[PDB]
Amino acid sequence: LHKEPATLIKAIDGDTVKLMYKGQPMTFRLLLVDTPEFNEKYGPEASAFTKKMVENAKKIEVEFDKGQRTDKYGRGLAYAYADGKMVNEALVRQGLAKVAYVYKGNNTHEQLLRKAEAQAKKEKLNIWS
Ligand SMILES: Cc1cn([C@H]2C[C@H](OP(=O)(O)O)[C@@H](COP(=O)(O)O)O2)c(=O)[nH]c1=O
Numbered sequence: 415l416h417k418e419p420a421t422l423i424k425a426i427d428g429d430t431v432k433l434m435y436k437g438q439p440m441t442f443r444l445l446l447v448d449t450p451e452f453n454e455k456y457g458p459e460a461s462a463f464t465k466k467m468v469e470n471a472k473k474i475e476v477e478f479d480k481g482q483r484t485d486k487y488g489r490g491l492a493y494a495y496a497d498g499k500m501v502n503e504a505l506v507r508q509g510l511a512k513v514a515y516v517y518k519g520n521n522t523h524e525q526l527l528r529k530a531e532a533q534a535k536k537e538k539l540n541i542w543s
């Protein structure tokens with residue numbers, strides 16, 4: 415997989431963010447995770463966590479996997495990086511997302527993320543508390 419440039423347009427929630435990619439505004443949905451909806455428990459905390467990570471970044475990058483790059487809603491499907499740190503992984507590691515939506519052929523980072531989830535769960539963080 416390859417990292418590509420993007421810039422922040424706007425934070426949205428824990429697992430979606432509006433970025434400019436190849437010069438076009440797109441909503442991105444983070445691969446292999448599920449944050450609570452803002453309406454739900456830990457929803458606001460997940461939103462805040464992603465918002466801080468993407469707003470504080472000097473450099474946003476997106477990384478597409480081997481399969482589908484857009485979902486049925488036109489959202490980009492990617493791993494997102496803030497100054498080299500994966501947002502997807504960071505959410506899971508903090509117990510603010512579950513590993514989820516693991517589709518064949520877009521699951522390169524699955525085992526990385528499941529390891530972070532095990533650690534979050536061992537620490538009883540957030541969703542696992
Ligand atoms: C993360 C992800 C979501 N989706 C679709 C599946 C779900 O369809 P449904 O809307 O019919 O439930 C939805 C969940 O995204 P959200 O968790 O953002 O709601 O997005 C993909 O198709 N591929 C993906 O990789």
Ligand SMILES: [Ca+2]
Pocket residue numbers: 429448449450451
């Ligand atoms: Ca969600």
